[PDB]
């Protein structure tokens, strides 16, 4: 399906912050990247996995936009 891209250094905390702003409201979908290649920034190959959430509300889209900007993640396209 779709495998989003995150750095996943501290995803346990990304997830928690996401629940702090609203806990338990939407499903977090997980995907993983097999045999990732050199990080565009880090310059190395690390495993990557991502949790992607579709929201109906605008307030949560803006919330998680700010969160993902603060978090080490690339969740830019719809």
């Amino acid at each position: 399906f779709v495998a989003g891209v995150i750095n996943r250094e501290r995803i346990p905390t990304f997830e928690r912050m996401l629940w702090r702003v609203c806990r338990g409201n939407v499903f977090l979908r997980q995907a993983e990247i097999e045999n990732p290649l050199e990080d565009p920034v880090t310059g190395d190959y690390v495993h990557k996995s991502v949790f992607i959430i579709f929201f109906q509300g605008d307030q949560l889209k803006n919330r998680v936009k700010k969160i993902c900007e603060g978090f080490r993640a690339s969740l830019y396209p719809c």
Binding site: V21, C22, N25, Q56, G57, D58, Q59, L60, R63
Partner: protein, 163 residues
């Protein structure tokens, strides 16, 4: 007296006893005082409105808390039913918060329970804003009289060089 305002899922009616009755989970083994809030049955339309409300209420809550402090400090200067050593907490409808919380309800007098959250939050906000401005006016008038009075008392005070 400080209080903690806490809410549990409340899925079971046993929660009240779980919260209050059963020592293993009751607050401080049922020694601490724990009273239920009487809150009217209100609805949240959407999640987006829920979040907006969350932020707006946090802002409004801090606003009103500040106003309460401002008016209490004003009266403290007045020294009428509050002082620095005693009567720091304000009374609710003329009784203490402990009494008020004992009989706590959401007050239809401040906002109808049939109002949407937006409208309710707005009515309260308007109320407090108005209260703050009324205080600003009365406090200005009192501080003005207080200073001018002292200035006149001082004018006829002092040593023979300046009195």
């Amino acid at each position: 007296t400080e209080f903690w305002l806490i809410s549990a899922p409340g899925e079971k009616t046993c929660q009240q006893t779980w919260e209050k009755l059963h020592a293993a989970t009751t607050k401080n083994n049922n020694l601490a005082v724990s009273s239920k809030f009487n809150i009217p049955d209100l609805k949240v339309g959407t999640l987006d409105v829920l979040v907006g409300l969350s932020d707006e209420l946090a802002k409004l809550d801090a606003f009103v808390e500040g106003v309460v402090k401002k008016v209490a400090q004003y009266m403290a200067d007045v020294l009428e039913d509050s002082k620095d050593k005693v009567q720091e907490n304000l009374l609710a409808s003329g009784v203490d918060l402990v009494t008020y919380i004992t009989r706590f309800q959401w007050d239809m007098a401040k906002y109808p329970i049939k109002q949407s959250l937006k409208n309710i939050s707005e009515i309260i906000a308007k109320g407090v804003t108005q209260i703050d401005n009324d205080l600003k006016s009365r406090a200005s008038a009192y501080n003005n009289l207080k200073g001018n009075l002292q200035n006149l008392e001082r004018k006829n005070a002092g040593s023979l060089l300046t009195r």
